[PDB]
Symmetry: D2
Subunit: 195 residues, 4 copies
């Protein structure tokens, strides 16, 4: 009589830009009415980002289109009739391969044109969920923070900074790499220094 | 010496969610510096939505990721050196197949549950570029505006309205169809009327 | 000295048509040489279906493009130097949402036009991994095998058969539904019977 | 009475991996029966690669999924009733951006390890429709055929060959580039030569 989840919502791991479909099977008499929520705020289907669907035998599903990290959160489904109300919950995690995104390239590489003494930042956006490990190299030498370079890593970009001002010797090829469980990506940036 | 477009920008027609790439070839001495614009506002590449790329021999390209109708506009590319500045222009049109988007479905169809006398609207979002022709039917009878139904069509949705209040006879299966040059889509909505 | 997997291959579950990337980290001196295998047969990278990539610090990855159920199997990675050889193994499972594929539709539905006494099969291809549960209904009545209908389900299609020959009463709307953990899909076929 | 194409098939240009939809509108009494053909061989819809669809008012469409260059050809639609038969024809051209596909990479670049005197080929698959212009460079020097290098370009790959046997001086970074109207792509291959 009161609503029950005969098949409960499953936690999902979905690749970025795929559709995530959350499915459950509800029993109860009278037939329970189902509502869907993202972090406790009701989802009203719009036909585009969110589609809500029902099938004979008590099957309910929510399709979330083209998932991004913004969709990676907890969802609830609620089933109600005059006999009671109950919810179930699932998390969606969205897998985003580690990726370096060069805004501008010259010959397949980043290019920074600096003048001597200029405090240069080589700012490189990246993606990745799980958050990727970021590394920088000049040629075949790993860069970390020392007296010469500063590395900045935020949620969305990494910058290699020359806080003391660039020197002529700073010219060269810098390699930035992002790694997580879904892949490794690297790109090169050429820095040249003019007087 | 002054900049010239040896290969000018081409007008593009790109399918929705594909990447649009605008390419040109620039000559001039000194090597011209190129800037890109959307409707006369400079595009600053971010690595995601917009990537700007350059190749030996004067080739310049802008990649616009995952195009939507918002990207369907006029773009300019400008080439400048100390000898002069000139631009070229291309339009991007984004092809979106006609598509009906049911927010909620029961057994593959829309469902509207109405009470007698209720002023019902069956509101159906749709997509399509070129803007699609919208038609409504009840069974095998085309509906237009008459003394009984009102059809609303906007840029993003169409509603079949029962402005006089639904009658029991209004129960049934309504078919909405969107057509343009890239395809036809239709969906059905079942209306039931309770006392 | 001998090769070791500092980071072993991970079992993967990838959505159909996405790229699967298998990644590992190898140590050893001299630097081990890595080969990749699908079910014990070496993968020779072609740049399209298969790309093999290596990065400083001993990282190795195989990218399998646009995965289909044919790619859902066991893979091996082998690392060899003069000190030894060792492999690691991962399974790729490819998630394919349950989906019904109507070859031909009239007004959004299948259509079968039969004559009385004709042994009709309504043959419906479907996809789904895990293999989906298939159900058939006429209106709101579940069909299984009885004295009247025969249901065939294979790896790739389901047919509703009328082995005794269709009767006039067999006319109507048949609903076929495929369900797995990644979604539910249904479609309708209208059967009409002529004398 | 006899069949007529009120709306004839349109020539299509579709991006690689998109769906191509060919649509027409047929008149005639009795209602004409429509068949579809690829290069004069009938298409039998399978629900996957090919879906054939019909809508009230005489609309007929063929959906070709996930188009490849193999689909880029001429199609016919035929409409027949007892009063006559007529066909219409459209070409599908499939746009494939120029793209270089490195089978194996080390640090983002191809890698060829050669011994002195070895007749090396650096074999690089590529895609592009229209067929792309291919160029090779060593550093900032364009390579064509001369007494030292041989360039091979086929429908699917390009090789830079060292027909005389590699010399130590052949070591270095070779850049291969593919260009067509839908974009430019380049990749680098490092060649090292051991005694």
């Amino acid at each position: 009589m009161a609503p029950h989840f005969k098949e409960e919502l499953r936690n999902l791991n979905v690749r970025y830009q795929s559709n995530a479909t959350l499915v459950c099977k509800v029993t109860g008499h009278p037939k329970p009415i189902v509502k869907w929520y993202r972090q406790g705020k009701e989802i009203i289907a719009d036909g585009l980002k969110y589609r809500i669907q029902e099938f004979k035998g008590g099957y309910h599903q929510l399709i979330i289109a083209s998932v991004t990290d913004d969709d990676a959160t907890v969802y609830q489904v609620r089933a109600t009739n005059q006999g009671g109300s109950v919810s179930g919950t699932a998390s969606l995690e969205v897998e985003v391969p580690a990726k370096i995104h060069l805004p501008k390239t010259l010959e397949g590489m980043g290019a920074v044109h600096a003048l001597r003494g200029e405090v240069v930042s080589i700012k490189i956006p990246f993606s990745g969920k799980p958050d990727p490990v970021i590394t920088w190299q000049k040629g075949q030498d790993l860069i970390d923070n020392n007296g010469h370079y500063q590395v900045i890593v935020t949620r969305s970009f990494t910058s290699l900074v020359f806080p003391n001002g660039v020197e002529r010797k700073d010219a060269g090829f810098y390699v930035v790499c992002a790694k997580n469980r879904f892949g490794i990506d690297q790109k090169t940036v050429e820095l040249d220094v003019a007087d």
